[PDB]
Amino acid sequence: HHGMASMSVSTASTEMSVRKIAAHMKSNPNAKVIFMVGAGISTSCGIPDFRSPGTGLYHNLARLKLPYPEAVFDVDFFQSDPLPFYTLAKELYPGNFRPSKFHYLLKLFQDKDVLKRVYTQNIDTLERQAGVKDDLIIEAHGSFAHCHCIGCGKVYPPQVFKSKLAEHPIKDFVKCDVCGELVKPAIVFFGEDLPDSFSETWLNDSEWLREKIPQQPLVIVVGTSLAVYPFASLPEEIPRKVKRVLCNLETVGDFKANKRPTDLIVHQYSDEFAEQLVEELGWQEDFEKILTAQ
Amino acid sequence: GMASMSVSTASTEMSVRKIAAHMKSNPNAKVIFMVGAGISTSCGIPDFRSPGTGLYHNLARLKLPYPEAVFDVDFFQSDPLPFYTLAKELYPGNFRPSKFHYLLKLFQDKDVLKRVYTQNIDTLERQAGVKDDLIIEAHGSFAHCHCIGCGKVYPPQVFKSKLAEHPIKDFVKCDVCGELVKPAIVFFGEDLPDSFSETWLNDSEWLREKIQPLVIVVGTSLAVYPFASLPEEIPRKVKRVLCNLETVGDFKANKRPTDLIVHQYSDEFAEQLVEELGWQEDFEKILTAQ
Amino acid sequence: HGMASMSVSTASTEMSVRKIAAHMKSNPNAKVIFMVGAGISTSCGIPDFRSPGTGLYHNLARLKLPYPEAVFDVDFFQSDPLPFYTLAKELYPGNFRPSKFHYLLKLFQDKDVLKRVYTQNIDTLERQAGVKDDLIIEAHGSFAHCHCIGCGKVYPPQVFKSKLAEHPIKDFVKCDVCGELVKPAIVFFGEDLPDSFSETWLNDSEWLREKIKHPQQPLVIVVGTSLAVYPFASLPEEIPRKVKRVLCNLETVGDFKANKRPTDLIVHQYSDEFAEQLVEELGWQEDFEKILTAQ
Ligand SMILES: Nc1ncnc2c1ncn2[C@@H]1O[C@H](COP(=O)(O)OP(=O)(O)OC[C@H]2O[C@@H](O)[C@H](O)[C@@H]2O)[C@@H](O)[C@H]1O
Ligand SMILES: Nc1ncnc2c1ncn2[C@@H]1O[C@H](COP(=O)(O)OP(=O)(O)OC[C@H]2O[C@@H](O)[C@H](O)[C@@H]2O)[C@@H](O)[C@H]1O
Ligand SMILES: Nc1ncnc2c1ncn2[C@@H]1O[C@H](COP(=O)(O)OP(=O)(O)OC[C@H]2O[C@@H](O)[C@H](O)[C@@H]2O)[C@@H](O)[C@H]1O
Ligand SMILES: [Cl-]
Ligand SMILES: [Cl-]
Ligand SMILES: [Cl-]
Ligand SMILES: [Cl-]
Ligand SMILES: [Zn+2]
Ligand SMILES: [Zn+2]
Ligand SMILES: [Zn+2]
């Protein structure tokens, strides 16, 4: 048997967890899956996460001589001193890296029509570079598609700011030609509001989920410490009747605070988790193809 | 009163003192225990999840695909040997009850035991003298066997004798549906015994009806459901006790003001609780008798 | 910096102390409530109660008690007061000087920015630092006077204190109107806290509720306490969600470890260091050093 009241353990090995997830999907064909990801799914691509000990970005910014680590991405600090961010802005642009196996899994799930959405906090855009349709990607923390004035919010093309970085001697910084305030790429900083698409789309997918509880859906959170708001408030807003999966090196956020009987916590690396899920779903072939094509 | 200076994080000595006090104030009140592997560690049976020593961390000679494969119904169905191989050591018999098990017997004698919900299959509470009507084996036992297919029940001996056979030839099958037959102990994926959900359903009301009760949880990491849901389902108006080496489950998440948490080994806990209750005599006699 | 903007729950210390000072700057004239425990007097040379090895409860072996907290339990006291008497001698205030954190409360007072200080200490150190009695709530009593554990009659201190000098302390002080034992008004487990505690909090809670038009936004700061004792430990949880909480302690505890609110500002610093750092971020280094020197 495998009823909702059958013996089970929340934290399980990758092998068992993937069997549970695979079983659910086979039992709920047509159902979709909502993913919520963070810097974790990009470490293997060569991009260190933010808060992991020793290797985290917030542990390798001594060069910037900042008052505190997170200052590089805080508007308050940006207004009073943009040199540091400019100095780091370079490496932040997409391009230098290739998607990971986990990023491609989202693509696979799309090709199999089981991806409902991907709320990401990353700005490396690897989820799109992997094949996922914009319609399905919710870049919760903005991106470099454009820039904006931190004063009135005027929107500008990338090129201008991207230019100022080139020139070594960082002269006066890009100002807003209409209010005179500082202009920067549209990646959310501490202090700023997230884009509209984020809270609006979530508002839609939340009713979608409530509608389903039909072929039951799943929500899978991976590679994030759920330490940043308002993004970290999503997992707890998932209806209790909707199964939640957490594939992370460590149990965090709502999974740690208010673990539910039906929760699935998997302490695994996103790529290993991705590999094992594909096999069990029986989608090795299609996945292999998607991987070789890139 | 109730809104006076009180702890929520006291020392072991004080906590034991308060538990005993509670019982003395409510002489007719009974207790409900909720136990796990932790109470049979001293008997020589290591628990399941403790770092390094835990059973799941020592299944190497069984060459499993993953730790919980042995007690997973899906793996068993497609490959029963590892369980057959491990089932030999799991059969009750080779051990004797711990001082804590006898504390259960002691409470029974004193008409203070309402129920004992256990997740152990070692049957040590039974071997300690606790009446069957007061014991609830939430995770089953080796008392009988059953078919993983149609649920039909059979006696123990056929499966137990097959274990004696060295190269386990053909595995026991159900003579009606042909599916595999195994001891009636709960595996991952399997539903629990009716007595569990049904007795709790009942005992729950008994509690809400008596609001003076006490529910003591000991020796379990509360990682396995639906058993793990038991603690939080205790009425807020009921005093909960947790005797475990580490704060776990609903005691760690939604801690309650009146919650007593004792970080102690169950045997010492019992040895000490017996002291504060002033029952040193009968207890020592029971330890001798059995 | 809207109510739904991007923020970190696990901010570093620098950012945390930064956010606090900023909140006060963008909310001048708003007051702050302090909730404190043994932690803030530790640097003064007064051990707290539960710190591994050094806490008081780990050092009463000589008193041969059934349990540590027994010296401060009415049930045990009512049956055997000798242990407390034996200890009581060294509990009386007056042998220590306030800590920098303590003077930090005074500073906050001078700036007319201190609403109240709920304290579980009985060292009277917030008072010795200059905090007005009306702004101080001693949730766990004091040695100001004594009382009968039976009828509750109040008595002057001296009668109980002199009784402590007598080499072989015998015939313990008793209520001359009911016969029960008398002791200094410091709260023991089993006893009801002083009336003003629950009542002042009843008002301060309404004050908080009425600050959330647009009144300057308050702030509740808890520091130096493990939140192991009720009803005090219920205060930080009874704080309205729309009011920021700050926890300055060596470790996260109470409602901060349990139901941590996104907005909570957790800081693992020694209370004295927290004071110095907060004073700097506030630009009050001058008014502080003068208060410190003038002591
Ligand atoms: N290969 C991996 N597989 C799975 N999890 C991983 C892996 N590598 C690291 N992790 C886990 O992923 C998490 C990474 O956490 P963070 O650094 O905090 O990243 P993220 O949560 O997305 O950070 C949120 C946000 O904070 C801002 O600083 C920034 O703006 C960003 O979007 C950690 O909990 C870590 O253990
Ligand atoms: N002497 C002791 N006294 C008190 N607590 C103890 C003692 N020894 C160990 N413990 C604690 O008891 C708990 C035992 O945890 P588990 O291994 O997880 O055991 P238990 O919860 O009962 O496991 C539940 C179930 O999981 C299945 O695998 C199995 O089927 C079983 O019934 C741990 O948190 C451990 O620290
Ligand atoms: N310099 C310091 N700065 C910050 N925190 C400190 C410092 N020194 C100790 N601490 C922390 O302060 C807390 C002290 O906790 P307690 O001993 O429990 O003290 P307190 O909470 O006030 O105890 C409450 C009450 O319990 C009774 O026993 C007694 O009556 C008392 O008022 C601990 O969490 C400890 O790590
Ligand atoms: Cl759909
Ligand atoms: Cl819900
Ligand atoms: Cl209830
Ligand atoms: Cl509220
Ligand atoms: Zn502008
Ligand atoms: Zn059958
Ligand atoms: Zn009296």
Swiss-Prot record, chain B:
It is found in: Cytoplasm; Nucleus. It catalyses: N(6)-acetyl-L-lysyl-[protein] + NAD(+) + H2O = 2''-O-acetyl-ADP-D-ribose + nicotinamide + L-lysyl-[protein]. One of its GO terms (biological process) is rDNA heterochromatin formation. Binds 1 zinc ion per subunit. The keyword Repressor applies. Its EC number is 2.3.1.286. Inhibited by ADP-ribose and nicotinamide. Residues 9-280 form the Deacetylase sirtuin-type domain. Its main location: cytoplasm. The keyword Phosphoprotein applies. Its cofactor is Zn(2+). GO terms for cellular component: cytoplasm; nucleus. GO terms for molecular function: histone deacetylase activity, NAD-dependent; histone H4K16 deacetylase activity, NAD-dependent; metal ion binding; NAD+ binding. It is an enzyme of class 2 (transferase). NAD(+) binds at residues 36-56, 119-122, 219-221, 244-246, 266. The modification N-acetylserine is found at residue 6. Zn(2+) binds at residues 147, 150, 174, 177. Keywords: Acetylation, Cytoplasm, Metal-binding, NAD, Nucleus, Phosphoprotein, Repressor, Transcription, Transcription regulation, Transferase, Zinc. NAD-dependent histone deacetylase that is involved in nuclear silencing events. Derepresses subtelomeric silencing and increases repression in nucleolar (rDNA) silencing. Its function is negatively regulated by active nuclear export. Homotrimer. Monomer. Homotrimeric in its unliganded state. Undergoes a trimer-monomer transition upon acetyl-lysine substrate binding. Belongs to the sirtuin family. Class I subfamily. Present with 5260 molecules/cell in log phase SD medium. This is NAD-dependent protein deacetylase HST2.
Swiss-Prot record, chain C:
It comes from Saccharomyces cerevisiae (strain ATCC 204508 / S288c) (Baker's yeast). Keywords: Acetylation, Cytoplasm, Metal-binding, NAD, Nucleus, Phosphoprotein, Repressor, Transcription, Transcription regulation, Transferase, Zinc. Zn(2+) binds at residues 148, 151, 175, 178. Belongs to the sirtuin family. Class I subfamily. NAD(+) binds at residues 37-57, 120-123, 224-226, 249-251, 271. GO terms for biological process: negative regulation of mitotic recombination; rDNA heterochromatin formation. It catalyses: N(6)-acetyl-L-lysyl-[protein] + NAD(+) + H2O = 2''-O-acetyl-ADP-D-ribose + nicotinamide + L-lysyl-[protein]. It comes from the Eukaryota. One of its GO terms (cellular component) is nucleus. The gene is HST2. The active site is at 140 (proton acceptor). It is found in: Cytoplasm; Nucleus. Homotrimer. Monomer. Homotrimeric in its unliganded state. Undergoes a trimer-monomer transition upon acetyl-lysine substrate binding. Its EC number is 2.3.1.286. Residues 10-285 form the Deacetylase sirtuin-type domain. The modification N-acetylserine is found at residue 7. Disulfide bonds: none annotated. NAD-dependent histone deacetylase that is involved in nuclear silencing events. Derepresses subtelomeric silencing and increases repression in nucleolar (rDNA) silencing. Its function is negatively regulated by active nuclear export. Present with 5260 molecules/cell in log phase SD medium. Inhibited by ADP-ribose and nicotinamide. Binds 1 zinc ion per subunit. This is NAD-dependent protein deacetylase HST2.
